[PDB]
Amino acid sequence: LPPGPLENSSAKLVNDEAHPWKPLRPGDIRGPCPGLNTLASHGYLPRNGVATPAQIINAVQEGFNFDNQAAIFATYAAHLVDGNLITDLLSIGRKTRLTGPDPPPPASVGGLNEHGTFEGDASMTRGDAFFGNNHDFNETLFEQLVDYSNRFGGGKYNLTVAGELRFKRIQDSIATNPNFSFVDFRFFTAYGETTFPANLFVDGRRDDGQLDMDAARSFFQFSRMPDDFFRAPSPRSGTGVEVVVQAHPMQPGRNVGKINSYTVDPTSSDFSTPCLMYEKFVNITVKSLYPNPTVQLRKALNTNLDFLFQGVAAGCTQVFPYGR
Ligand code: HEM
Ligand SMILES: *[C@@H]1O[C@H](CO)[C@@H](O)[C@H](O)[C@H]1NC(C)=O
Ligand SMILES: *[C@@H]1O[C@H](CO)[C@@H](O)[C@H](O)[C@H]1NC(C)=O
Ligand SMILES: *[C@@H]1O[C@H](CO)[C@@H](O)[C@H](O)[C@H]1NC(C)=O
Ligand SMILES: *[C@@H]1O[C@H](CO)[C@@H](O)[C@H](O)[C@H]1NC(C)=O
Ligand SMILES: *[C@@H]1O[C@H](CO)[C@@H](O)[C@H](O)[C@H]1NC(C)=O
Ligand SMILES: C=Cc1ccccc1
Ligand SMILES: [Cl-]
Ligand SMILES: [Mg+2]
């Protein structure tokens, strides 16, 4: 079952004796998410980077005070498209045999590194998959985050910086990635993720939304909490995303096999249709990976789809691609 919210959601030391940072061992997996990477590298998750959905939800709440609804939606979305539904295991990075025997194609069970399922283009500190690596920390891109922080944040990363950098990354992908895709699920996640460093990597004793560059590097590059790091003082995820969107409002779309060909997609969800993003994710994305599942997979799909729906904002109607 999906874990419930924290019983005590106060700020507290999370870089503590029970959760020390350790370097990677051979075989340890890290991926495109600095939050999950940091939780693995402090032992909030298994240090090898393979975890159950329940482990992930507990870790993001306990270590960072990620809110329960957001934790549930993100975790089960990722698990449905990137995880093994029979073994209940998900890699936070590359595809691995450690998630167990694979389902039939076209399901990939590729981990969070799988491009175009959860992971996608115009990430802040990771390159687009077209350029050869969608998961490793990129120093040039991080230095650009530093530059934007210097220009728009007085040297700190905040929501103003996020609004400018988010747009810059989009414009850079339009100009250079002929396969750039920015629709549906990625269109939503790309905006919310830009708020996370301001909401969740800021020491919770301050919680002022101003992330210093030393802390930013520690999380983004080294998957490491600052010495004496306190988590946020209340549950949150994407609060202030409105600021990021308002800076440079965009329509969902894609380049069409050439640079500088960004073409709006009217069949995409956008922020005016959040229930459509959920419905397409289930009806198109999940269904295409598992078009005619065998009995044990159908059962696992339906269970995880029920859990996914628990993280969907009230107002939306549940959809049932495999029946009830
Ligand atoms: C709850 C489960 C979570 C899952 C399954 C997850 C997964 C992912 C994935 C696959 C990406 C890649 C998107 C991209 O292409 O850029 C991503 C990005 C990101 N995640 Fe998470 N994440 C979760 C929670 C969190 C939390 C709790 C934090 C912070 C405490 C966080 C911080 C970030 C950041 C900053 C990025 C953007 C990295 C960048 O653009 O350079 N995530 N996450
Ligand atoms: C919640 O945890 C904080 C910090 O660890 C502690 O000081 C506080 O008293 C706790 N609240 C309850 C109701 O136990
Ligand atoms: C190119 O875009 C398509 C979806 O539009 C996606 O399936 C494919 O994986 C992308 N490849 C790269 C390398 O970006
Ligand atoms: C990092 O990003 C830059 C800027 O897009 C790119 O040119 C470079 O090849 C990427 N990879 C590395 C390893 O620096
Ligand atoms: C970001 O920092 C700059 C410089 O301190 C400031 O002008 C701006 O109001 C900040 N934005 C937010 C959302 O805190
Ligand atoms: C998803 O499929 C259901 C049928 O199970 C249908 O009612 C709904 O309109 C579909 N939504 C989309 C966006 O395709
Ligand atoms: C940072 C991963 C994630 C989690 C929830 C929404 C968008 C992205
Ligand atoms: Cl919560
Ligand atoms: Mg990416």
UniProtKB/Swiss-Prot annotation:
Cysteine pairings via disulfide bonds: C275-C316
- Write down the species: Cyclocybe aegerita (Black poplar mushroom)
Name used for this protein in its record: Aromatic peroxygenase
**Catalytic activities:** RH + H2O2 = ROH + H2O
Required co-factor(s) are: heme b
How pH affects activity?
A: Optimum pH is 4.7 with ABTS as substrate. Optimum pH is 7.2 with benzyl alcohol as substrate, and there is another optimum at pH 6.2. Optimum pH is 7.2 with dimethoxyphenol as substrate. Optimum pH is 6.0 with naphthalene as substrate. Optimum pH is 7.0 with pyridine as substrate. Optimum pH is 7.0 with veratryl alcohol as substrate, and there is another optimum at pH 5.5.
Q: Which UniProt keywords apply?
A: Disulfide bond, Glycoprotein, Heme, Hydrogen peroxide, Iron, Metal-binding, Oxidoreductase, Peroxidase, Signal
State the superkingdom.
Eukaryota
Statement: the UniProt record of this protein carries the keyword DNA repair: no
Task: Kindly list the positions annotated as binding heme.
Answer: C33
Free-text description of this protein's post-translational modifications in UniProt = N-glycosylated.
